[PDB]
């Protein structure tokens, strides 16, 4: 799959935007996908479990769980109920917050 071409200004008309150089000095890091998109996926199960997955998380997932939990709790009032999977390196939040986490992770520089 090709490297995306260098554009003049960002974001691109589709809203794509490359990861920034240098990588930010957070404790954690999130990769991109094959397709250079930031990896926050929605996920339904049982027909009513709406949830969202941050997936290629490399580093300290517990800092990422603290920062996500600090980011979403004004949008909910309560702390969001999450689950880190330290093995695979995912983080799983309950309820759809895909657009907010994609925008948020673009702000963070990943």
């Amino acid at each position: 799959i090709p490297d995306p071409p260098k554009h003049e200004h960002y974001p691109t008309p589709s809203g794509w935007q490359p990861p920034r150089d240098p990588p930010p000095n957070l404790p954690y890091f999130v990769r991109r996908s094959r397709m250079h998109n930031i990896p926050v996926y929605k996920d339904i199960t049982h027909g009513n479990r709406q949830m969202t997955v941050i997936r290629k998380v490399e580093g300290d997932i517990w800092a990422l769980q603290k920062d996500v939990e600090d980011f979403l709790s004004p949008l909910l009032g309560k702390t969001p109920v999450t689950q880190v999977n330290e093995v695979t390196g995912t983080l799983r939040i309950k309820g759809y917050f895909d657009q907010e986490l994609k925008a948020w992770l673009l702000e963070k520089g990943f």
């Binding site: 995306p4 071409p5 008309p13």
Partner: protein, 49 residues
């Protein structure tokens, strides 16, 4: 979708975009069995194109 493919280098707009170029960029999966007769353009995303 097509602006998205052009931005990420997957479809080169400085050449003609036939159906082979949308398949090789893997922008559109079309299957001739199951009687797809090809692509239809769709007006979604006309503003911001």
């Amino acid at each position: 979708r097509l602006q998205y493919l052009i931005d990420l280098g997957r479809v080169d707009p400085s050449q003609p975009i036939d159906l082979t170029q949308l398949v090789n960029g893997r922008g559109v999966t079309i299957q001739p069995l199951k009687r797809d007769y090809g692509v239809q353009l769709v007006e979604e995303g006309a503003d911001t194109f």
